[PDB]
Structure formats: structure tokens, C-alpha cells
Amino acid sequence: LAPYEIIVSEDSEHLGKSIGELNVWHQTGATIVAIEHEGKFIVSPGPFSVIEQGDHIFFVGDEDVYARMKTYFNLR
Amino acid sequence: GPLAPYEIIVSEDSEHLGKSIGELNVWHQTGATIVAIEHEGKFIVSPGPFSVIEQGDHIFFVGDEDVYARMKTYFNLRMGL
Ligand SMILES: Nc1ncnc2c1ncn2[C@@H]1O[C@@H]2COP(=O)(O)O[C@H]3[C@@H](O)[C@H](n4cnc5c(N)ncnc54)O[C@@H]3COP(=O)(O)O[C@H]2[C@H]1O
């Protein structure tokens, strides 16, 4: 149940959007447990939390979900 | 730490049992983000809206102490308090 962490530092059409707007679980299979933004954490973020460039996304899933999240945010 | 999941065993009768996470709309009801369900000793991680919560399952979720209190009340686990 340990979360993966990615840093969304690359340009992506998925930045500047809320978790619900992206519909993250349906896009990547990931359940986001926290967002780190400017060194501050929001746990259990809900659909209205926004993912901005440079933020850290903590999420649960398997290795395939990790791969989907990386590709989805242009981290390849 | 703060991202460590809470664990509740939904052992009491509840109108919410036999429903999917999406039907319950869990995050909007309790503030909790469910990370896994344990059912018959088997774990589903990142369960999504179609996973069903059945009596006796263990629900693992992130939140704070207040979210825990909401989940416990929501699933009829208050033990008379
Ligand atoms: N693991 C879970 N724990 C707690 N509740 C859960 C849940 N999975 C689903 N739900 C609840 O069911 C609703 C629909 O979930 P769905 O995954 O289809 O649709 C979700 C999902 O695609 C996405 N989403 C929201 N929060 C997410 C998160 N932390 N991680 C990944 N995707 C999320 O935005 C959509 C709307 O989310 P919203 O919270 O308004 O509504 C969610 C939520 O109330």
C-alpha cells in the first residue's frame, strides 16, 4: 500500500486541471493519496484539487499504474 | 506518518454495505480516499468506483483523525458513542 511518487515537471495538457476534471482513476488506474505543492501537502485531495507543474503526486496502484501515470504526465 | 492508511473492519450492519464505492460516493460522504479493500483475505489496491464493500471487509483509507471519525460513523462503528 506504499505510494508511488512522481514530480510533474514536464509540460503537459494535464497540468492546470483538477483531479476530477482529469478523471484520473479512469485515465491511469491510479488513486491519488496526496499532492505536494510548494512543499506543502494535501492528503485525500478530492476532485477539486488542482495539479500544477512541479507538484508531486503520491498515488497507489501497481507497476502498470505507475507506468500509465508517467506516460500520462509526459515523464518519458 | 500522515500518509499511513487507517484501517476499519466493517463488521456492523449498515445501509452502506453491498454497495459500490461510486454508489456510496465515499470521498464526498466522509472525506476519505480508499486505497485498498481486503475481502476474504484478498487485497484490491486502487479499487475504483465499481469495487463493492461487503460486511467484514477491511477498508484502508487516507485522511486525518476527523476523516477517520466520519468513516467510523458512516459504517455504524460507533459502539453506542
Ligand atoms: N478510492 C476512492 N475513495 C473514496 N471515494 C472514491 C474512491 N473511488 C471513487 N470514489 C467516489 O466515487 C466517485 C466516482 O469515482 P470515479 O473513480 O468514477 O471518478 C473520480 C476519479 O476518476 C477522479 N478522482 C477523484 N479523486 C481521485 C483521486 N484521489 N485519485 C484518482 N482519481 C480521483 O474524479 C472523479 C470524481 O471524483 P469524486 O471524488 O467527485 O467522486 C468519486 C468518489 O466520491
Author numbering:
A (entry chain B): 135 to 210
B (entry chain A): 133 to 213
What's written in the study?
BusR is a member of a yet structurally uncharacterized subfamily of the GntR family of transcription factors that downregulates transcription of the genes for the BusA (OpuA) glycine-betaine transporter upon c-di-AMP binding. BusR satisfies the overall domain architecture of the GntR family with its N-terminal winged helix-turn-helix motif (wHTH) and a C-terminal effector binding motif, an RCK_C domain (regulator of K+ conductance). Our structural data, supported by biochemical and biophysical data, reveal that BusR utilizes a unique domain assembly with a tetrameric coiled-coil in between the binding platforms, serving as a molecular ruler to specifically recognize a 22 bp separated bipartite binding motif. Binding of c-di-AMP to BusR induces a shift in equilibrium from an inactivated towards an activated state that allows BusR to bind the target DNA, leading to transcriptional repression.
We purified and crystallized a construct comprising only the RCK_C domain (Leu135 to end) and solved its ligand-free and c-di-AMP bound structure to 1 and 1.2 Å resolution, respectively. The crystal of the RCK_C domain in the c-di-AMP bound state contains the physiological dimer in the asymmetric unit with one moiety of c-di-AMP bound. The c-di-AMP binding pocket is localized in the cleft between αR1 of the two RCK_C subunits in a conserved hydrophobic and narrow pocket formed by residues Ile153, Gly154, Val158, Ala164, Thr165, Ile166, Pro181 and the main chain of Trp159 and Gly180. Residues Asn157 and His160 form a polar rim around the pocket. The high-resolution structure of the RCK_C domain explains very well the high specificity of BusR for c-di-AMP and how it discriminates its ligand even from structurally closely related molecules such as its linearized variant 5′-pApA, or c-di-GMP. The adenine base, especially its amino group forms hydrogen bonds to the peptide backbone of Ile166 while Ala164 at the same time prevents a larger group at C2 of the adenine base, thus preventing c-di-GMP from binding. The 2′-OH group of the ribose is coordinated via a hydrogen bond by Asp157 and the phosphate group forms a hydrogen bond with His160. The individual monomers are identical and the resulting assembly is symmetric, therefore all protein-ligand interactions are mirrored on the opposite site of c-di-AMP. The apo and c-di-AMP bound crystal structure of the RCK_C domain show that c-di-AMP binding induces a subtle rotation of the RCK_C domains that results in a widening of the binding pocket. This movement pushes residues Pro179, Gly180, Pro181 and Phe182 (chain A) further out in respect to Trp159 (chain B) of the opposing chain.
